[PDB]
Amino acid sequence: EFNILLATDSYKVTHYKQYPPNTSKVYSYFECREKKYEETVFYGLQYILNKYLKGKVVTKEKIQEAKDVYKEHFQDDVFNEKGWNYILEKYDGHLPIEIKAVPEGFVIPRGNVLFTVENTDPECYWLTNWIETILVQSWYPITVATNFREQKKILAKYLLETSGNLDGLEYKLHDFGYRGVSSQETAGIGASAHLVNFKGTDTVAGLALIKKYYGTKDPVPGYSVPAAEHSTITAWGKDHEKDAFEHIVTQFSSVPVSVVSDSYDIYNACEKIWGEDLRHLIVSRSTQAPLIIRPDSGNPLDTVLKVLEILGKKFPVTENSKGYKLLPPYLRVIQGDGVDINTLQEIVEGMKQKMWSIENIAFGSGGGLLQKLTRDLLNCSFKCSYVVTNGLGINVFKDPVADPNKRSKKGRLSLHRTPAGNFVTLEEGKGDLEEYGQDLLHTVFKNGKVTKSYSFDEIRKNAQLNIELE
Amino acid sequence: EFNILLATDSYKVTHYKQYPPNTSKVYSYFECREKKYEETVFYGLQYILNKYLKGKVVTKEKIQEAKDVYKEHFQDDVFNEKGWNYILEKYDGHLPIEIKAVPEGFVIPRGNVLFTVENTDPECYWLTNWIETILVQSWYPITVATNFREQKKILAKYLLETSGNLDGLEYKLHDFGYRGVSSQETAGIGASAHLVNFKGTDTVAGLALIKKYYGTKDPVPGYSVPAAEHSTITAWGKDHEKDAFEHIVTQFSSVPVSVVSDSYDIYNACEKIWGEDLRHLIVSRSTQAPLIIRPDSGNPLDTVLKVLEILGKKFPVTENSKGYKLLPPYLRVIQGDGVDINTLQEIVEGMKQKMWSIENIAFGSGGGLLQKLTRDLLNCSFKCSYVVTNGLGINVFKDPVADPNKRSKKGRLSLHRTPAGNFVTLEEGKGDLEEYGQDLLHTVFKNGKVTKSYSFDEIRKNAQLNIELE
Ligand SMILES: O=C(NCc1ccc(S(=O)(=O)c2cc(F)cc(F)c2)cc1)c1ccc2n(cc[n+]2[C@@H]2O[C@H](COP(=O)(O)O)[C@@H](O)[C@H]2O)c1
Ligand SMILES: O=C(NCc1ccc(S(=O)(=O)c2cc(F)cc(F)c2)cc1)c1ccc2n(cc[n+]2[C@@H]2O[C@H](COP(=O)(O)O)[C@@H](O)[C@H]2O)c1
């Protein structure tokens, strides 16, 4: 089981000794520093508050456990037993910390305060940055939620242009990333961030996380349909791919089914097997139960265009009111190999140039996508901006000579609406002047309690695209 | 709590219906496919076996939980209740699976079988690839362990060249990556993979994982020492950086201490503050308690060289028996900003060109490093190679026309020593001919039990460098 005393960077065990004497407040903040990704979706903090930070997180056994680990880890007695004892005794092991944050799902320009952290008891001045390590991991859900929102913008633009509406937009990017991320916990967190934007997922761990920590309007927040994998095709033997296809589509005759078609030869599969041998089993399917053919290899754009071209020559094609080609309603395509933000855009643009509607296609996003995301992408950063020492508030910051991009904000911070309705972060306590109306940060955690919560519904609403609102 | 019935990709829920009728065995394998990283360290499977796969992992409540989720997730009844019931009743919820694997810590060339998975009961033919998703996540510890071994090779080469020995090699790359990875679980797994190669870490989660799932020779598998962070320097106020430095080194006068020195001006900090104002507090320190100065911004190579140059002009420098410059034993440097496999090599080479011993420096590795690692780097791949249908064994594989790199191995597999002592993977059951001696894969899991285990000690020994052995 989890011990918060063992869930920090080792050096932070030694920091209580290092602050200026008689420091009664350490106040820190998180932002996605400025200097493509101009706005970020704030999401994921609530998961961390609930799983790791709330309630009685300190016990005598956890204190003794950490004392023993750190004695061996540092080969010395540096662990602050007294400090944690104080928390245990005075607060019944609840953390004397207050966290204020912008609402989950909010879409905020870079370079704004997203949350602040401070101690509520002068003796716990050291606790603020002890928990930096765990809080800074919010970089991941923020970054995943942001990246998928950007992909949703691309899909919305092209779907609107080629079809005239946004029908089905929320099912156009399906999460395939479960196996390609680094852990079960990461799979759940990342999938939950995908689901802020979309409704189709195979990462079941995301469903469980959302139900436990956020809650949903509907029984589940995401959906899937039956589909083959290479093993269920190749198990039939090379010469029996047709038999596998027939078996599978028949077993799933009345619901949508997707069938990977590139095990041996995608082009032969589409033209000869689906297009001729089994064509009678396709054209008889309901609109509510299409076959969704999946290529999974080759150049993504070339293979999609070539598959569309083949199907278009074997199946009746219509031209929609925008002038774009549309497969019959019982037949669609999904591309789930090598799809990232760059290649997604390349494919939909290539489709548009060849006069194919984006209605025809869906995409699957893999795990490598998310693995390539780093805390550096949006410059997710946690810094101390204010301390009280000897009863005097002091505005503090770093400003390394060889990197002005690493300069940090100074003093007490607050987040506001501008007269033009944008966001602004006020430094040095200037929010107190009340020239910019109400601080948009809410207290979400205080003294062991989660004081403000968001349902997954509120988060999805906050994260909507403008084009979705228009 | 964790439900294995909900820990797969959604589509795999539907696969039991898709295999050829009367299939009694599905046998699959994992490899780091061929086609820089020519050999990989096999590590991490044991964590997964113990945490997720062993014992009674199926219960009636878990079956009903999954049934309810999947009914809503698919908007249909597709979940295989009967199959999981069978496991619960016949095997007391233990998984009828056998996994055979190369020993943990083994260093193996690409394109070899690393583990195999098969069902042990004909009714559970579908269970083999149900668990693909969870097993394939072994890509992460394998890849992290491999990447850190490659960095260790670079450090060993340059430390030997510039000092004549490998003293301290195992403390030259310290894990700083806790905050920059995607979750607590990932932090633990990745840190454990780092610790296969090194002994210095700040990712405390790695200690806990190793103690629980592998076990160590010593009380803990990794160590750290006290150190500042920017907040403990900047909290003093801009004009009092000197006061912060003095306070910190005095508080830690008798143990090693590292102090980040770039809050405002790294070059002034080294030349004027450490080099003049506080120089008397440095030259008085024990060899067992050096000050380790940390730059953390600017071009990594340039800043390291400039810091060395400055310290060399303010402190007595010796020339070792190899002809390289060496700071006094109470003074060292650590660079923990932007260090990856490329930049590490650039820095040690640049140091070598300026005649500085690698004894002078240590490195910190960040989280972005590990985030940039993907399952694609070593081409980690899980494929079905053999099925038994109608009592007949059939060798199966995929071979997509537009990507011969995605071709898979055929038939029953085994791993062997070659006459020249290298590794070879035999396909199509050819291992049974016994022309290549004993299969190197061991049964590590069978029917709910972990049948062979490795201590962290055996893994570290297996993963040693050749130069360490020589
Ligand atoms: O089909 C799969 N699921 C079912 C499915 C069927 C149809 C649609 S749809 O047309 O959007 C649609 C949605 C809807 F809600 C309703 C509808 F009617 C239709 C969506 C989903 C399916 C397929 C593949 C798959 N996977 C999970 C991992 N994978 C593979 O695993 C690998 C991932 O590894 P990397 O991370 O390295 O990339 C890669 O091979 C990757 O293809 C899942
Ligand atoms: O000093 C730090 N720990 C103590 C320490 C002191 C000395 C040595 S040594 O000279 O090897 C040594 C080892 C030994 F065993 C014994 C000895 F005697 C000496 C090692 C370790 C320390 C410092 C910084 C630090 N951190 C943890 C995260 N961070 C920062 O957090 C950020 C990471 O974010 P990204 O993932 O995006 O990169 C980045 O700013 C990164 O610098 C930890």
Numbering used by the authors:
A (entry chain A), B (entry chain A): 8 to 42, 53 to 487
Manuscript text:
NAMPT functions as a homo-dimeric enzyme that catalyzes the rate limiting step in the primary salvage pathway for NAD synthesis, the transfer of a phosphoribosyl residue from 5-phosphoribosyl-1-pyrophosphate (PRPP) to nicotinamide (NAM) to produce nicotinamide mononucleotide (NMN). Crystal structures of NAMPT in numerous ligand-bound forms have been reported. These structures consistently display a NAMPT homo-dimer with two essentially identical active sites at the dimer interface. Typical NAMPT inhibitors were found to occupy the portion of active site responsible for NAM binding and a tunnel-shaped cavity extending from the NAM binding site.
However, the part of NAMPT structure that is responsible for inhibitor binding is not affected by the S165 mutations. This prompted us to investigate whether the mutations had effects on the phosphoribosylated (pRib) adduct of the inhibitors, because it has been shown that the cellular potency of NAMPT inhibitors is dependent on the formation of a pRib adduct and the resulting inhibitory activity of the compound adduct. We determined the crystal structures of NAMPT-S165F in complex with GNE-617, a close analogue of GNE 618, and its adduct pRib-GNE-617. These structures revealed that the pRib-GNE-617 binding converted 380GRS back into a helical conformation. The dramatic conformational changes induced by binding the pRib-adduct suggested a significant energetic barrier and decreased inhibitory activity.
